[PDB]
Symmetry: D2
């Protein structure tokens, strides 16, 4: 449901994700990272799949954050792909990819992969 | 860098990506697939990190497509993370993650990973 | 240290990993999976990097399991890449890739990615 | 399928892989890199799933290389997961994970991911 996703979420590293799920499948908000060459909030945009999920199935979604704002420019972007699972303790379990802009020669080492779990606190 | 991302791109599988890069970091457009429980165009939204301009590196970007439109609902979403490189032959080199909505029981096997290279040819 | 890694380990899904770290960087053992089209034990082989790790740094390692034994043949293989962290509660944190043999047309969907954390019980 | 994996392979970067596939699933050989904090040959060990034989699919396999030899110790290890396809032009298509040993503080950024295609050309 859009509502269920809308809110303030935090992950294990201490980063903040503030999101609004819109009626048409859109996700917009800001992300505050606790790691990296990140300073302040960054704009995020994503999409989620408005499932008829009468299976106890999670809702698939994903979003992107380009690490550039008015204070810093890290020349990198991260995409998180995962699913939202609601209940008393709603969680968003994700796997992410962080690509840094590089010269052709270092391209082979341009992408990091990891996983983050988000816990909701506010709507 | 910048502007050059705007246009129509194609991947090795035959999927087409039509994007508009906005001056402040936004990416908007539509994605038409070649594989999957897909059927027609899907909305895509993303972000790119624009700035330097001089020689160097590619431009980092990422975007998402939830596979639900007026025709199909595959209950999944794909995110591509990569970098744009322009020049005589511009390309976007990406690695993607495709997550399907599952029950916890199948959660361990919900995400596929791959890579795609897009060109305007 | 090889010893530290040698032992019986379990992950959150309930699978068993029995390993022996050898002096030359080798890892051999058996793996018992709790999920998949897996039945019984499967042979595993890997390598670890005998670090001078006087940094409180983890030990990098990796191993592979081809899901075929005398009882089942799943036509797939999994590789786990991660690091061993010792202490009172020794853990091996990993990220894995599971590739299934497929026809050329379905190759785009041949690989799954995930993460597993192993807790040691025995040597 | 089977046998055909044995030989010397090369990836787009210029690294060379020399492997022996044993009749019961084992993979042994040496890997010589083109990039990294690498210097010469490194030992590799892996497994492949052999069986069917008739038309179809590729053969699933995987292998690991810890980047430590008598010359260098990069305190990292790489695992490649993929499938072998033979025919007039045989290839091994893989996706890899490279993990470096870090302190917990940098654990979030310890693993790189990529893909490599190896040919005997
Ligand atoms: Cl984060
Ligand atoms: Cl595609
Ligand atoms: Cl699809
Ligand atoms: Cl497992
Ligand atoms: Cl390589
Ligand atoms: Cl390397
Ligand atoms: Na992150
Ligand atoms: Na794709
Ligand atoms: Na697994
Ligand atoms: Na490599």
């Amino acid at each position: 449901a859009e509502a269920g996703i809308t809110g303030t979420w935090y992950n294990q590293l201490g980063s903040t994700f503030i999101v609004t799920a819109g009626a048409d499948g859109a996700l917009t908000g800001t992300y505050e990272s606790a790691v990296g060459n990140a300073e302040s909030r960054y704009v995020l945009t994503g999409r989620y799949d408005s499932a008829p999920a009468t299976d106890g199935s999670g809702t698939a979604l994903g979003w992107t954050v380009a690490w550039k704002n008015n204070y810093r420019n890290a020349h990198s972007a991260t995409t998180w792909s995962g699913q939202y699972v609601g209940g008393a303790e709603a969680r968003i379990n994700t796997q992410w990819l962080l690509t840094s802009g590089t010269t052709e020669a270092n391209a082979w080492k341009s992408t990091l992969v990891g996983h983050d779990t988000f816990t909701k606190v506010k709507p």
